[PDB]
Amino acid sequence: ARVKRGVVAHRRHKKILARAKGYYGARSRVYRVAFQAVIKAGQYAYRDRRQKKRQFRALWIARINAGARQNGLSYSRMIDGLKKAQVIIDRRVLADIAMHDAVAFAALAEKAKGALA
Amino acid sequence: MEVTAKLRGAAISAQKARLVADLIRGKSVAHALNILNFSNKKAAVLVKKALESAIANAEHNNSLDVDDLKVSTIYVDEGMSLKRIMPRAKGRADRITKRTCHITVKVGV
């Protein structure tokens, strides 16, 4: 029962090379190089699925800081005021409002100042 | 419509013939023939043979006018190689590759 490896080996190599599409030079042509590139891409993606949440929260915080400073507060004081006022709107929605609706963000800042008073 | 001529097994490197191919790519047939007739390259003779064959094909099998023709497509491909042994000093031997090429010329109006 002699077994020839050609068909299955070719399928596996072709699948790896297909996942390596778009890479530079030997990384999209040569199996030994392409296989390392795919694994490292997977490792990077696993790490960056965690990094993405941090980066987007940092962006929301920066935009909220800009809005609060336009309304006469700092970010930390505005967050403290909202907590004391019991408002539980999260930073993603707060930054969306800060970017797209200035009047509503002004109202939120006024509520935060009123609670801080 | 394009009319094709292929010269296969020309005894010259594809890298060397591609310079003449790029020299005449896209030009009108009369200008290309002048360039080939006054070039001093070896590949010019082979490229001229292929181009004249393509012009004759377009004239005889397709009844196209000569004055409207240009070199619409041209490229050179690697052919079969010949392998030889060159004896070096101190009993060492090297392998020599004698390269050939395929020339494809298409003319159109």
Partner: protein, 103 residues
């Protein structure tokens, strides 16, 4: 007019007629869902910020269906340590269409 609702441990700012995907819900396709815990309602100049929640506000949505997001590959590899493992993932979602907002 737009409102702020909470679904699936997250929050969304929605308008009437908007289609959005949230975490998987147990409601049947074609059913109607009502959010009674609206956090904020804005009607241009009428701005209501709920202390926790705007009293009396309602958001009404219709369940379009259920589905799965695109496949994600998980890859783990410790170099020089002879260790490797892989797995796939597709997250479930429920699709909603906002049909009503009442402050």
């Amino acid at each position: 007019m737009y409102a702020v609702i909470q679904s699936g441990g997250k929050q969304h700012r929605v308008v009437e007629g908007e289609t959005l995907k949230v975490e998987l819900l147990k409601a049947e396709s074609g059913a109607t869902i009502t959010f009674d815990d609206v956090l904020m309602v804005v009607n241009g100049d009428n701005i209501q910020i709920g202390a926790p929640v705007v009293a009396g506000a309602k958001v009404t949505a219709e369940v379009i269906g259920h589905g799965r997001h695109d496949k994600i590959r998980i890859i783990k590899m410790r170099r020089r340590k002879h260790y490797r493992k892989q797995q796939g993932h597709r997250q479930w979602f429920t699709e909603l269409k906002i049909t009503g907002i009442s402050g």
